[PDB]
Amino acid sequence: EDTICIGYHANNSTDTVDTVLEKNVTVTHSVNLLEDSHNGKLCLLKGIAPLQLGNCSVAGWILGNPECELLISRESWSYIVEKPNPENGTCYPGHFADYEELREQLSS
Amino acid sequence: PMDECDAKCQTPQGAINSSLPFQNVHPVTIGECPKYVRSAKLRMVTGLRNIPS
Amino acid sequence: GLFGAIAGFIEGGWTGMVDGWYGYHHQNEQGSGYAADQKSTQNAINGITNKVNSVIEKMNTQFTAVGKEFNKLERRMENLNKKVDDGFIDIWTYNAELLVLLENERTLDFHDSNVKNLYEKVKSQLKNNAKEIGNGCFEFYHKCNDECMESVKNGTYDYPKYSEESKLNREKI
Amino acid sequence: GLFGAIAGFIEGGWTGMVDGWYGYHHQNEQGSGYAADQKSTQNAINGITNKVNSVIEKMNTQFTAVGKEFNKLERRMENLNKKVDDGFIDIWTYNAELLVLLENERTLDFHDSNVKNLYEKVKSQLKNNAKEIGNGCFEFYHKCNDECMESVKNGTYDYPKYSEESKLNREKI
Amino acid sequence: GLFGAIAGFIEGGWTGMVDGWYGYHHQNEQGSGYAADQKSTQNAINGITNKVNSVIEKMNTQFTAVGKEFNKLERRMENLNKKVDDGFIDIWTYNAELLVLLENERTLDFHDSNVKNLYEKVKSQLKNNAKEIGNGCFEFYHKCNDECMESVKNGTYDYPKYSEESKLNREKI
Ligand SMILES: *[C@@H]1O[C@H](CO)[C@@H](O[C@@H]2O[C@H](CO)[C@@H](O)[C@H](O)[C@H]2NC(C)=O)[C@H](O)[C@H]1NC(C)=O
Numbered sequence: 001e002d003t004i005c006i007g008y009h010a011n012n013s014t015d016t017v018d019t020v021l022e023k024n025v026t027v028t029h030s031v032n033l034l035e036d037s038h039n040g041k042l043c044l045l046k047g048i049a050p051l052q053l054g055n056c057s058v059a060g061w062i063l064g065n066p067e068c069e070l071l072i073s074r075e076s077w078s079y080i081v082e083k084p085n086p087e088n089g090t091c092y093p094g095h096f097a098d099y100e101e102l103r104e105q106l107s108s
Numbered sequence: 109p110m111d112e113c114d115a116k117c118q119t120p121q122g123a124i125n126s127s128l129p130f131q132n133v134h135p136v137t138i139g140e141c142p143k144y145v146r147s148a149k150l151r152m153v154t155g156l157r158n159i160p161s
Numbered sequence: 162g163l164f165g166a167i168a169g170f171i172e173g174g175w176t177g178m179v180d181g182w183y184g185y186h187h188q189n190e191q192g193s194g195y196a197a198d199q200k201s202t203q204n205a206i207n208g209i210t211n212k213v214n215s216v217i218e219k220m221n222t223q224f225t226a227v228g229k230e231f232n233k234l235e236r237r238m239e240n241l242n243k244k245v246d247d248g249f250i251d252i253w254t255y256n257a258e259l260l261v262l263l264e265n266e267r268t269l270d271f272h273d274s275n276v277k278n279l280y281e282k283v284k285s286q287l288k289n290n291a292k293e294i295g296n297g298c299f300e301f302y303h304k305c306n307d308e309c310m311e312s313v314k315n316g317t318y319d320y321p322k323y324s325e326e327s328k329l330n331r332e333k334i
Numbered sequence: 335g336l337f338g339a340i341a342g343f344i345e346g347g348w349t350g351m352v353d354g355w356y357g358y359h360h361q362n363e364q365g366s367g368y369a370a371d372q373k374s375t376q377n378a379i380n381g382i383t384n385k386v387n388s389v390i391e392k393m394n395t396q397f398t399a400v401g402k403e404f405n406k407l408e409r410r411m412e413n414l415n416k417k418v419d420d421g422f423i424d425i426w427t428y429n430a431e432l433l434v435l436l437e438n439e440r441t442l443d444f445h446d447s448n449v450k451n452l453y454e455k456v457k458s459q460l461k462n463n464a465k466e467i468g469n470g471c472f473e474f475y476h477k478c479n480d481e482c483m484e485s486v487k488n489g490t491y492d493y494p495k496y497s498e499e500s501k502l503n504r505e506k507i
Numbered sequence: 508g509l510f511g512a513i514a515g516f517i518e519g520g521w522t523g524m525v526d527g528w529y530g531y532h533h534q535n536e537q538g539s540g541y542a543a544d545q546k547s548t549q550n551a552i553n554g555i556t557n558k559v560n561s562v563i564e565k566m567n568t569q570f571t572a573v574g575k576e577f578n579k580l581e582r583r584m585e586n587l588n589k590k591v592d593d594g595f596i597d598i599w600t601y602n603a604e605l606l607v608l609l610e611n612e613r614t615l616d617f618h619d620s621n622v623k624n625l626y627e628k629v630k631s632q633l634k635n636n637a638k639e640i641g642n643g644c645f646e647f648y649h650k651c652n653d654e655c656m657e658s659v660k661n662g663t664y665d666y667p668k669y670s671e672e673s674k675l676n677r678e679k680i
């Protein structure tokens with residue numbers, strides 16, 4: 001004869017969480033809060049370009065190393081780009097005091 | 109590599125989607141950015157449990 | 162089934178219906194079928210929207226520059242700034258992780274409570290006119306058409322409709 | 335009405351009574367009126383007091399001096415101390431805001447649960463002797479005076495008092 | 508008794524049984540005794556284990572060196588590093604303390620809910636065949652042996668067993 005029942009949703013899904021009372025806990029729908037990924041690119045802010053040094057040091061950039069493009073046209077930019085191990089330090093070596101401080105002052 | 113693409117947050121490992129609150133990816137960032145953790149994952153539930161029978 | 166249904170008196174969920182997270186399954190002479198409860202479902206999902214907006218937006222992301230660097234004649238500032246940053250990182254990590262665990266727990270409780278409420282709504286009309294059966298379902302001592310289904314969804318039954326049919330078809334049992 | 339009453343089977347609240355947050359409304363031949371449940375009400379409000387004491391006091395406010403200032407030859411310390419302070423400010427902000435939202439949610443659940451409990455207490459005495467009606471109320475198959483009201487408030491009925499009057503006045507229905 | 512039992516319809520606990528946190532008390536002609544519900548008890552305790560693992564492990568403790576020291580010509584760094592460290596200390600303190608209070612609250616609610624669920628499980632079999640009594644207990648209009656006890660524990664009754672004995676021994680009442 002006739003019958004009424006409750007009902008609710010399930011699916012084929014197997015996305016999972018951890019939870020206080022059980023782990024790998026399966027649900028239908030989820031949402032990843034995290035941005036676990038990176039595009040592996042050096043994009044630019046907002047339409048504002050960054051500064052690039054290529055191979056140069058900050059010393060080779062600021063001082064006028066001819067192997068470093070001076071780039072007076074670069075009036076302002078989004079952020080500074082280097083490599084970790086910059087090639088072209090000073091062709092005539094010498095101490096460069098407060099390198100840190102000048103970097104932080106030229107942070108922006 | 110350097111690219112013409114645009115962003116709102118950036119790090120050496122890549123340019124970053126500034127939509128979400130968090131990464132676990134690398135602490136160093138510049139811009140309108142997430143915050144770093146030392147973790148694998150964070151996934152809030154929207155739905156609920158799945159059991160067929 | 163914190164509050165008694167899902168892994169409670171109910172064992173499991175159903176894959177047939179997809180339009181909304183909750184509903185009923187109707188069974189009558191015309192046939193069988195599933196049909197979703199968009200009222201409470203949409204109310205709940207509005208709650209989830211207001212949650213996740215009230216999780217993401219509560220951050221304030223500055224136009225930031227993270228990193229620094231130092232000489233070896235300022236290890237004070239180096240090991241400090243390490244400890245400082247790692248302190249922050251760990252605190253956000255801990256608070257955030259507990260928030261995900263607890264919020265998903267409260268989401269399970271939110272769902273569980275909503276279905277339990279609806280089960281009481283279904284019961285509230287059909288108390289003596291129709292009986293509990295098994296789990297998850299009520300059997301009628303009378304008969305019910307699709308109009309009766311649609312009525313019982315939106316909080317309408319008209320109690321004296323099949324009061325007497327239930328009052329007689331009970332009495333063999 | 336997380337647990338089924340307030341925006342649940344109950345639709346709304348009442349402005350007439352002010353002495354305590356909960357109570358009953360009595361209806362009998364002598365008249366109508368509202369009367370507050372100071373027992374559970376005061377128990378709950380003691381809970382709220384212990385909450386807010388256990389929110390405010392858990393801070394420890396030092397005899398503090400916040401600010402600093404620097405030259406332009408220590409932008410490291412400037413932009414650092416900016417990031418440091420803003421980091422703290424944001425973390426307190428986030429944790430605090432989530433605490434207000436969640437605590438008020440749990441306060442709604444606290445109230446909802448207390449009234450639901452009391453509804454079960456009212457039901458537990460008067461199960462067969464008197465019936466559910468509508469929502470929020472029970473009708474008696476017998477009659478009840480102010481002594482009966484005051485008895486049923488404090489957890490007393492004496493079940494065989496009107497057992498028979500209910501057992502006969504049911505039977506027309 | 509947030510959800511209605513413990514300091515609710517139940518007044519207090521019992522010291523006789525120790526093998527598991529929950530159970531039943533059986534009363535029949537063979538005698539009296541207590542017996543524990545290891546199913547739901549162990550399920551819950553697995554939950555508590557997963558909690559406390561998910562509290563302790565969510566810390567990450569570095570191979571750390573806490574302290575520093577300074578001259579009096581760097582009071583900036585002194586009073587800073589004081590404020591920095593005290594800031595961290597207070598934030599961990601506040602978050603941790605709220606976590607202990609709230610987690611123990613949710614533990615009480617977890618227990619309360621589990622027993623309430625089980626009370627509904629006990630009721631679900633024996634609805635008309637046996638009655639509510641007092642609080643915490645159901646009286647049978649029929650008789651029940653240790654096999655009947657052990658059956659009713661694991662979610663088995665066979666409803667038509669004593670349906671008729673209840674259907675007749677009711678009728679004097
Ligand atoms: C940056 O450094 C690399 C070194 O790897 C330079 O690479 C040289 O490029 C020239 C052509 O431009 C070749 O003739 C050399 O054989 C390359 N050497 C190596 C080791 O790769 C690169 O040119 C430098 N770029 C700038 C802009 O300075």
Ligand SMILES: *[C@@H]1O[C@H](CO)[C@@H](O)[C@H](O)[C@H]1NC(C)=O
Nearest residue numbers: 010011012013014015028179
């Ligand atoms: C589950 O269903 C969704 C939607 O049809 C689909 O995207 C997904 O690939 C399916 N997964 C499996 C394992 O069938």
Ligand SMILES: *[C@@H]1O[C@H](CO)[C@@H](O)[C@H](O)[C@H]1NC(C)=O
Nearest residue numbers: 014015016022023024025026
């Ligand atoms: C989840 O963890 C439980 C722990 O016992 C295990 O039984 C189950 O196989 C796990 N499932 C997956 C998909 O990892």
Ligand SMILES: *[C@@H]1O[C@H](CO)[C@@H](O)[C@H](O)[C@H]1NC(C)=O
Nearest residue numbers: 035039114124125126127128
């Ligand atoms: C950024 O994230 C949002 C939300 O996840 C997504 O809609 C968008 O496509 C993403 N964009 C890129 C470029 O990753």
Ligand SMILES: *[C@@H]1O[C@H](CO)[C@@H](O)[C@H](O)[C@H]1NC(C)=O
Nearest residue numbers: 308309310311312313315317
């Ligand atoms: C409820 O459903 C019935 C049909 O089952 C319909 O006549 C009535 O208008 C509906 N009411 C509302 C408020 O939707």
Ligand SMILES: *[C@@H]1O[C@H](CO)[C@@H](O)[C@H](O)[C@H]1NC(C)=O
Nearest residue numbers: 481482483484485486488490
């Ligand atoms: C409860 O109320 C009745 C009257 O309604 C009174 O006789 C009795 O003493 C009261 N008991 C308590 C404990 O207040």
Ligand SMILES: *[C@@H]1O[C@H](CO)[C@@H](O)[C@H](O)[C@H]1NC(C)=O
Nearest residue numbers: 654655656657658659661663
């Ligand atoms: C439940 O207990 C009964 C006896 O009391 C036994 O016959 C039955 O096999 C048990 N079932 C399970 C699933 O343990």
